[PDB]
Design a binder for this molecule. Structure first.
Ligand SMILES: Brc1ccc(N2CCCNCC2)cn1
Ligand SMILES: Brc1ccc(N2CCCNCC2)cn1
Ligand SMILES: Brc1ccc(N2CCCNCC2)cn1
Ligand SMILES: Brc1ccc(N2CCCNCC2)cn1
Ligand SMILES: Brc1ccc(N2CCCNCC2)cn1
Lengths: 196, 202, 199, 201, 202
């Protein structure tokens, strides 16, 4: 097997529409914040840029003197239907939409995303700063099909008007009126402020 | 049958172009708006910027499958399904679909589709900054299918509404109508969702 | 024939790239604008932002079917039909199509397409804030098909009560114009929108 | 041959990825800008927002057909044709194509494509508000094809909007052949000089 | 071989999904930014709007052909080629590609791709209106391919193609190459840092 063969196989046998459940798919989500571009304390809206690190297992991609990994167009893979509940724009994907697939079927996808959110911006210009909570989960898959779990400034722009004080991550299971099942989400709390 | 098989069948066999009429009866579509946020109101221009889950429900028997020893539901790309051609009459921007465009299909052919949508509308914003608030009428119906092909029907208000909005929801009421338009002889159905909201105090 | 069969046939035999001309003659296209809203006006730049239903009508016989015991009409994705290449000459943005892009096809091959469109135009906005108002002229015609191939003809009821503006009158004029580039004449309809700001 | 056959043949046979080079000579492309409107000007930033028909003409013999008893012309989706990779060097936005993207093909293989385009440019806007006006120079040429592959050649207010805040004083066209540092070959361009000025309310 | 044959061949057999890594070594990608314009600067937000030719160079042997009696080069739609997944780390808008998206392929498999791009960046704009000017750092590298698979290296005059009508002028351009690790991953990924030193014109 060479890269070409591996990539050919994944393409022809790829089943993107099909959730790779084994005998729920455990999805890991983590936001790596890169920049905060605009803030509005009046409207409670922020414009953020972050790497959305997403991790899961699709055994149907696995393979046996060959490369251990390849980069694969996500259009050829099943991807979890994650959405940000309080996003107020559709995510602008900044980077090439490639996933990374390991021979055992593990998948990394980590696009850089710019997106606007509705959240608590109050206090942004104080010592203690604002704490903006972003809620991400599967849109249509309940807890028996997809589970999400977590995994501050390492990649954060030194040239932003703002700075990051802290990032905390909390996991939840919520029942919505529309449906009987519980749907999991991760809540990323971004604590930031305008700089002195 | 496993998920893969079900989704393969749907892929191959589903007909997105074909209205799942039964015996020349109209497809009964259920519509309900779950308001999430109100982003920018303009009392001068009478325009509002709203975010809502558009909960849409209908039956397409051609999707059904014997679920005796199979999954009861699957998530399906709406590009693989027939979807009702609903439109908001008083929308002034095309709908921005925020969420993955997946429908949920039950073994008996019932379909849920509930994308989160951001869309600007032209409606009555007068009084938005009063006790009584504004009452914004959003009108949604089939664009091209009359009452004998498609029928629309309604199904907490603020249950999913953002606590961080500058606004608050006082009430949401849903009214159903049947309208005849100058272009065409037939009647076309619509649901009118009345959103009663106001600016929050200082 | 049921809907499925009709739609299968149309998809299997549709030539979306081929203008359905009856012998040497031109396809008769009907165009009519049903104004829904006026959103933004600029009397300085002479630019208006308008929302209108673009009612378009023509005949494609190749779509017809024996409806003796079959549905009389179906809704069809316009990607599966030939559509006239109409454009607004004085549009300054590409048309934003607001509604599902479905046409309506009758068993005899008549086609209705009426999407709701938001588009900005360049036109005379002067006087918009006077009792007599502005008169904004919008010119729509086939872009590449001349009069021998395509002919266009005209056909507040749906106007938003919440617009800052009101419609005084709408008139439609059809024209045939010769352009520098080409020897042939190209037809267009001119819709004159007479509107003003409200009290 | 009817229209359907002609369009089928072209769709199934024509090759858009392939430059219609005849006899190892360059494809002669004609370019001409028909200005329709000037929408926004900024004398500070030296940026203009313009709308123009981009009249483009060339020969692709591989499209030709015996029109003895057939239509002389058809309209064809440009996605089905080879099109010259023309670009405006000083454009600062990608071209917004306003019209249906149809070319016109004559039985002998001549092609007209004339979409209406809105695009913003960086150019000399100084003097826009004077009697002589500004002269905004627009440079168009093949992006990747050098002079032995593609040659560009030229051919004012006729189609210009009476409702623009501006008016056109003159349009001149100049043709050039330039060698860029990056590459050994010469690349041709046409420079359209737009001479315009602000009208007054 | 004529152009048509070569292009039929490339199209028919080219795998855009496959990194053309010869014998286990990394594909050597050359990157160079030719700045064309600076359109808007904001010293407060530290954001710049830039237009540049992104000169990109690499080898894909699988494209090569015997050019004994054939054309030496062709222009090819990049959708038909493998292209390195380069991204600007500090870009804050997705790149607007201004030019036709054609690569140039030489008979030996060398590829040039040089689109003109307009993109906005977050970087140090401080001092833009002084003698020494601002120095805006742009970081470009492979997004998913580490140093064993893709290596990036720099490629003349900063202002050779720069617009004389810009409100700004270029004082200097320097290029630095680095090798950096990231949390998600054990391997090192290469990048080139282009330092753009510019200021307001008189
Ligand atoms: Br179809 C379909 C089913 C459920 C949902 N949601 C409800 C369940 C949890 N996520 C929020 C969206 C959306 N579309
Ligand atoms: Br095709 C076709 C037929 C009817 C309509 N309209 C009229 C009836 C109801 N919705 C408004 C649009 C639009 N397109
Ligand atoms: Br191809 C081709 C030929 C002619 C035209 N125009 C000129 C004729 C009337 N409509 C305006 C555009 C556009 N494309
Ligand atoms: Br590939 C490739 C090679 C050269 C160029 N340019 C240089 C030659 C003339 N136009 C400027 C763009 C663009 N793409
Ligand atoms: Br898949 C995948 C793997 C790694 C990364 N990143 C880390 C390596 C360098 N570029 C930044 C993003 C992105 N996507």
């Amino acid at each position: 097997l060479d890269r070409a063969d591996i990539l050919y196989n994944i393409r022809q046998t790829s089943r993107p529409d099909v959730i790779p459940t084994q005998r729920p798919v455990a999805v890991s989500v983590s936001l790596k914040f890169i920049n905060i571009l605009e803030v509005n304390e009046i409207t409670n809206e922020v414009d953020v840029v972050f790497w959305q690190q997403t991790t899961w297992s699709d055994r149907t991609l696995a393979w046996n003197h060959s490369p251990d990994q390849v980069s694969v167009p996500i259009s050829s893979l099943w991807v979890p239907d994650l959405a940000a509940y309080n996003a107020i724009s559709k995510p602008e994907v900044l980077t090439p939409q490639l996933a990374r697939v390991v021979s055992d079927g593990e998948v990394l996808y980590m696009p850089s995303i710019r997106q606007r959110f509705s959240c608590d911006v109050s206090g942004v210009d104080t010592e203690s700063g604002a704490t903006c909570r972003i809620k991400i989960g599967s849109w249509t898959h309940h807890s028996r099909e997809i589970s999400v779990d977590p995994t501050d400034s390492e990649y954060f722009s030194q040239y932003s008007r703002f700075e990051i004080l802290d990032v905390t991550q909390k996991k939840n299971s919520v029942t919505y009126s529309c449906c009987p099942e519980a749907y999991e989400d991760v809540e990323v709390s971004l604590n930031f402020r305008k700089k002195g």
